[PDB]
Coordinates of C-alpha atoms and ligand atoms in Angstrom, one line a residue:
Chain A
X3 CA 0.0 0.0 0.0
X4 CA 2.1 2.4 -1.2
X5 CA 1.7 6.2 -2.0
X6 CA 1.7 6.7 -5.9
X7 CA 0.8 9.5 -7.9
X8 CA -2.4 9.2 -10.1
X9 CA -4.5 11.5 -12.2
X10 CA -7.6 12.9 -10.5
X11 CA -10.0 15.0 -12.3
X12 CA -11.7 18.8 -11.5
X13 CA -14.9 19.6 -13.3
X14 CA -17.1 22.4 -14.0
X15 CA -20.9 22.0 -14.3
X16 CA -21.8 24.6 -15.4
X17 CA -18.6 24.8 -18.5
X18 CA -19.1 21.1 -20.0
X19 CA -15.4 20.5 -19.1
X20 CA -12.7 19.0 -16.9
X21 CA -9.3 19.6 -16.0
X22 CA -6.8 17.0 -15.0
X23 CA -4.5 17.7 -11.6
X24 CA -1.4 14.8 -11.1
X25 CA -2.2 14.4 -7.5
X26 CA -0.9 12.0 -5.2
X27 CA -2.6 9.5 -3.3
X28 CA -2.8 5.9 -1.8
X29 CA -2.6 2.6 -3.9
X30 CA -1.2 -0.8 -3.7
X31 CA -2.0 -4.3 -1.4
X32 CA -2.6 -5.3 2.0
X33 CA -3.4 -8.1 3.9
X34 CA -6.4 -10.3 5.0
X35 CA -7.9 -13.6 6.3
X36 CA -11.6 -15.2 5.9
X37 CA -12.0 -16.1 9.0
X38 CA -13.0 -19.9 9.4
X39 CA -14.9 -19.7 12.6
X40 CA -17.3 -16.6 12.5
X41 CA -17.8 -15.9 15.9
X42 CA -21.3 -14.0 15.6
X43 CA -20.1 -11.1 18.1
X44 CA -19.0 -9.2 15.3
X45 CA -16.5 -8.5 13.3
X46 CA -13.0 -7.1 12.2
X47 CA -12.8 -4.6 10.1
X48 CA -10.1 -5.8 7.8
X49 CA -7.6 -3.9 7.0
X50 CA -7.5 -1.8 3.5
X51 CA -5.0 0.9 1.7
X52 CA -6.4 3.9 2.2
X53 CA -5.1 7.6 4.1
X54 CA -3.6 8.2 7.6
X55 CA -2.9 11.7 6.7
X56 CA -4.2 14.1 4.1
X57 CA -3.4 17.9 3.4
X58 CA -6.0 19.8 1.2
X59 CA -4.9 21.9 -1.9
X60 CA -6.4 24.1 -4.1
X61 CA -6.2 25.0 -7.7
X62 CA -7.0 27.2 -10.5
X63 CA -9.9 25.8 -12.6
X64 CA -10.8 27.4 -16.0
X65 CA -14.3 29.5 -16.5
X66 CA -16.4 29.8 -19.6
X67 CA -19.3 31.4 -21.7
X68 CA -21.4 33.1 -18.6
X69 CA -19.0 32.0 -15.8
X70 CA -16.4 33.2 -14.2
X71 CA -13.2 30.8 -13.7
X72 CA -13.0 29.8 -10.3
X73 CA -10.9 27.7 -7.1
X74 CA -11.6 24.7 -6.5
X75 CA -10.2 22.2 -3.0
X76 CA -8.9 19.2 -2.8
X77 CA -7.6 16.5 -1.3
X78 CA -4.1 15.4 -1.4
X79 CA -2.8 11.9 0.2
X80 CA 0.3 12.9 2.9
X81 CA 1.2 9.2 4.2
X82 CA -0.5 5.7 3.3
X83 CA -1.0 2.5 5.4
X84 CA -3.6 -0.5 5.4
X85 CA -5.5 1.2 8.1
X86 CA -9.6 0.6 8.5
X87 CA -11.2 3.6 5.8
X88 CA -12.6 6.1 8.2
X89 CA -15.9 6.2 7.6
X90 CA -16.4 9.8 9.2
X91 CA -15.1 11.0 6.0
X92 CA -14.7 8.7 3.2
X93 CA -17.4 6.8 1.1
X94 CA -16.3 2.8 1.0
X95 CA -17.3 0.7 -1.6
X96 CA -16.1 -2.0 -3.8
X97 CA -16.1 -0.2 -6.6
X98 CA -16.5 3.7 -7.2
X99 CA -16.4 6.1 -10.7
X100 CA -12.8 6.3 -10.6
X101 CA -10.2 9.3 -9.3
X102 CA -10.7 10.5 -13.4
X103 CA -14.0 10.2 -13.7
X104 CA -15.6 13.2 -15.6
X105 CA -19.4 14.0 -16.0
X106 CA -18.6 16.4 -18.3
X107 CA -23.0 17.0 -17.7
X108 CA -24.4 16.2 -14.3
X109 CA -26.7 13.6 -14.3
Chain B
X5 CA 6.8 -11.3 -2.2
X6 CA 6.7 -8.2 -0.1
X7 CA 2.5 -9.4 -0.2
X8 CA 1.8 -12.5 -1.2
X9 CA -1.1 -13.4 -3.3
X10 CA -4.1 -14.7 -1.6
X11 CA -4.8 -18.8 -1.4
X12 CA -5.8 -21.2 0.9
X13 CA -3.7 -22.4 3.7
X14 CA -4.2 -25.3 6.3
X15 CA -5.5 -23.9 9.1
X16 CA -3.4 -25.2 11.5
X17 CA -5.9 -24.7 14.8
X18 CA -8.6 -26.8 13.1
X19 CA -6.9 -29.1 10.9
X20 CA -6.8 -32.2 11.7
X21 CA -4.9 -36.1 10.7
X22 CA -6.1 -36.9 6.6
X23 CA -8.4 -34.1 7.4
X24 CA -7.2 -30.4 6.8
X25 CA -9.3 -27.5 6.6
X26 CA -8.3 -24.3 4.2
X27 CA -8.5 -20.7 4.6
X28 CA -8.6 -18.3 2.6
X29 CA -5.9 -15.8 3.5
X30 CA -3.4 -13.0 1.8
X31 CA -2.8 -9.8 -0.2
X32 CA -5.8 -7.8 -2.6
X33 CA -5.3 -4.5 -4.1
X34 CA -7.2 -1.8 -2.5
X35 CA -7.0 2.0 -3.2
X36 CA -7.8 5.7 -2.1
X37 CA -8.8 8.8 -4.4
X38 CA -10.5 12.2 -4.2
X39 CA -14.2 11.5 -4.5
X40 CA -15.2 12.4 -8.2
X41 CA -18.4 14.9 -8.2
X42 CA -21.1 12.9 -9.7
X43 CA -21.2 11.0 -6.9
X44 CA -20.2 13.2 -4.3
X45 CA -23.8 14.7 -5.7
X46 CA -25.7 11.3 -4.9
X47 CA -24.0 11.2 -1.6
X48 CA -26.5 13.1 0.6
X49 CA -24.3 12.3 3.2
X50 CA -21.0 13.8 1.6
X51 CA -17.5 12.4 1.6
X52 CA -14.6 13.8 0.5
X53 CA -12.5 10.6 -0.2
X54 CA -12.9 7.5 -1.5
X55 CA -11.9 3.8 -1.0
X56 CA -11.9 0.6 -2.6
X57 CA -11.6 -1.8 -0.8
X58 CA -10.8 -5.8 -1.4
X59 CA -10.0 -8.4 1.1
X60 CA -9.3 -11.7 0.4
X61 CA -12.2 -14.0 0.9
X62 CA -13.5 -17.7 0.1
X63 CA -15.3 -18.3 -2.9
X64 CA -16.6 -21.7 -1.9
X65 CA -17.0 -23.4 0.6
X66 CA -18.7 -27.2 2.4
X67 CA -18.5 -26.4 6.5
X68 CA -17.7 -29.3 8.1
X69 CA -18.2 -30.4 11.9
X70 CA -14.6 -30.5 13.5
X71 CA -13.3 -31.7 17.2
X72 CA -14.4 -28.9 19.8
X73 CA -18.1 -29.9 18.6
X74 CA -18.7 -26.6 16.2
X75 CA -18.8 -26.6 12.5
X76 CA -16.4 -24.0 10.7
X77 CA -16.2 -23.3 7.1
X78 CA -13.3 -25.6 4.8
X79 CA -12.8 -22.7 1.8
X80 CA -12.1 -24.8 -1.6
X81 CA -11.5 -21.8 -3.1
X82 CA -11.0 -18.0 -2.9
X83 CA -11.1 -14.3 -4.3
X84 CA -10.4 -10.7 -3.8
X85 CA -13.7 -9.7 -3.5
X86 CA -15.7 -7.5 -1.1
X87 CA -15.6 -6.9 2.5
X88 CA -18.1 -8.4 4.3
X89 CA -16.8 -8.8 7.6
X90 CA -17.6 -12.0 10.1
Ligands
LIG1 C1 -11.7 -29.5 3.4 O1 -11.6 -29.3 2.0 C2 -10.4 -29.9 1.4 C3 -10.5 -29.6 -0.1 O2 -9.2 -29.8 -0.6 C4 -10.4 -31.5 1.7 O3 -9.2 -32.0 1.2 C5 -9.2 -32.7 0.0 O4 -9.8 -34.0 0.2 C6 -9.7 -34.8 -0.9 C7 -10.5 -36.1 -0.6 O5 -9.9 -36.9 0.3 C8 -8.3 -35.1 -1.3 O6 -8.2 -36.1 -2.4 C9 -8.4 -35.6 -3.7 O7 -9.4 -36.4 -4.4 C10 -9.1 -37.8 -4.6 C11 -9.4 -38.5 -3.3 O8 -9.0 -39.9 -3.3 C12 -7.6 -38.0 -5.0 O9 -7.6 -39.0 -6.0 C13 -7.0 -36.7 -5.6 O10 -5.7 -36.9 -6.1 C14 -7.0 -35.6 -4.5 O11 -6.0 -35.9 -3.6 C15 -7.6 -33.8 -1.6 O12 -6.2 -34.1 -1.9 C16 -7.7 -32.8 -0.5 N1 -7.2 -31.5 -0.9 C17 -6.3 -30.9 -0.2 C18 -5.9 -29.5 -0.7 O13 -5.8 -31.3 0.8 C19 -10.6 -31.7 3.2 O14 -10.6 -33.1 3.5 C20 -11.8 -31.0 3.8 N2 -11.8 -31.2 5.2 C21 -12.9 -31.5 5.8 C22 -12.9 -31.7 7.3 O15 -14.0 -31.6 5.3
LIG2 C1 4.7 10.1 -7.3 O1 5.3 10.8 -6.2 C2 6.5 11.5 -6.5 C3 6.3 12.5 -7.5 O2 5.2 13.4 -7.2 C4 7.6 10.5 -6.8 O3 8.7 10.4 -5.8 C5 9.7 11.4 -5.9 O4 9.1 12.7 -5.9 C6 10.0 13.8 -6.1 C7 9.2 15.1 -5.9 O5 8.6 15.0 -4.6 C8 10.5 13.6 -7.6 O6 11.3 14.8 -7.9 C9 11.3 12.4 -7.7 O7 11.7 12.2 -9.0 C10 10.5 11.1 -7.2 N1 11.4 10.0 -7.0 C11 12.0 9.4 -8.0 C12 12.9 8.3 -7.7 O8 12.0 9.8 -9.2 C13 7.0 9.1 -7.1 O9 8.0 8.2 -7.7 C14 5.8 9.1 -7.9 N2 5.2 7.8 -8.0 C15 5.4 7.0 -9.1 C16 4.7 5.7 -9.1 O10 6.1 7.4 -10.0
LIG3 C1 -14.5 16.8 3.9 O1 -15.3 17.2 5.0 C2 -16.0 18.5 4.8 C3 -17.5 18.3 4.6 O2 -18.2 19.0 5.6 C4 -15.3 19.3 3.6 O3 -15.8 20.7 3.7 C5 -14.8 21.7 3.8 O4 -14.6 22.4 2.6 C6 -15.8 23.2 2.2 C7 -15.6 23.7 0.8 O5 -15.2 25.1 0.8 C8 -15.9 24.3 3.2 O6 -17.1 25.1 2.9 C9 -16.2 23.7 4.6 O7 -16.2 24.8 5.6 C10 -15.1 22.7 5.0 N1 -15.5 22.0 6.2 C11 -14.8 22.1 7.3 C12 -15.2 21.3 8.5 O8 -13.8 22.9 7.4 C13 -13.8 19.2 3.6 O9 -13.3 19.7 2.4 C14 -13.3 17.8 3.7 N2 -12.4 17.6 4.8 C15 -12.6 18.2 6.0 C16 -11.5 18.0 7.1 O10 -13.6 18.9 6.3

């Protein structure tokens, strides 16, 4: 579970566009067992590669026809580890859209 | 090496003479990433990261009735798939 760089990707509603940052983050493999005896007093998180530290940023991101070019925030990976996701702050699934993921039109 | 791909492995605590027992057991990919807007839209409850997680989990498996008197699960096969925990 290292710490690689990867490409996010900033969008604009309301301009039909999106801008690529090379932001670092967290990426890589950890390790976990399937427990053979489930005792039902749950659980055990399992461990994952995910964020133990992360420092926000900000960049510049382009305007358009009738708006004007604005900030946007966002955060950056500082350290990684195979800690537990912290719920309180990210959204863990199996499968998301992807750090690139651009809906160039919301919905 | 440094992570070694997950397989089954003789479960040593509830193996037993002819008799083994395998577990499912070792590394899976996983990742973090800024949470992409479309969904940071759907998310009434908004998050500003994003993980995707993958532990290593059996595929298949018969449960079989073993010494103490309790039944555990053999795994005959396994995955990276999702977290369910137990
Ligand atoms: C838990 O599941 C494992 C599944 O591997 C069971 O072990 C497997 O048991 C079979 C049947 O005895 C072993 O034999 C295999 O099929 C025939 C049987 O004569 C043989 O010709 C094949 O060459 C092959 O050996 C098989 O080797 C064995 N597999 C492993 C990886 O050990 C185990 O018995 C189950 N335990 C319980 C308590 O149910
Ligand atoms: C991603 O993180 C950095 C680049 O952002 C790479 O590590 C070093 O980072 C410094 C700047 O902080 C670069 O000047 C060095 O060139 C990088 N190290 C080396 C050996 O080149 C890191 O390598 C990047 N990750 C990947 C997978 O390339
Ligand atoms: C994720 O958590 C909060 C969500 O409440 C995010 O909100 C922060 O950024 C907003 C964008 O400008 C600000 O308006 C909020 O004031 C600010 N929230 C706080 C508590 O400072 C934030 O970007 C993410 N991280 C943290 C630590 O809040």
């Amino acid at each position: 579970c290292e710490l690689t760089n990867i490409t996010i990707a900033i969008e604009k509603e309301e301009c039909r566009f999106c801008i690529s940052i090379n932001t670092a983050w967290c990426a890589g493999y950890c390790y976990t067992r399937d427990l053979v005896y489930k005792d039902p007093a749950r659980p055990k998180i399992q461990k994952t590669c995910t964020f133990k530290e992360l420092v926000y940023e900000t960049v510049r991101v382009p305007g358009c026809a009738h708006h004007a070019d604005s900030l946007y925030t966002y955060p950056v990976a500082t350290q990684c580890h195979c800690g537990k996701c912290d719920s309180d702050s990210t959204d863990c699934t199996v499968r998301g859209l992807g750090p690139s993921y651009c809906s160039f039109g919301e919905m | 090496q440094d992570c070694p791909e997950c397989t089954l492995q003789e479960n040593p605590f509830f193996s037993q003479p002819g008799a083994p027992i395998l577990q499912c057991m070792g590394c899976c990919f996983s990742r973090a990433y800024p949470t992409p807007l479309r969904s940071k839209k759907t998310m009434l409850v908004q998050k500003n990261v994003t993980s995707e997680s993958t532990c290593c989990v059996a595929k298949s498996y018969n449960r079989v009735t073993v010494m103490g008197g309790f039944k555990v699960e053999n795994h005959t096969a396994c995955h990276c798939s999702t977290c369910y925990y137990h």
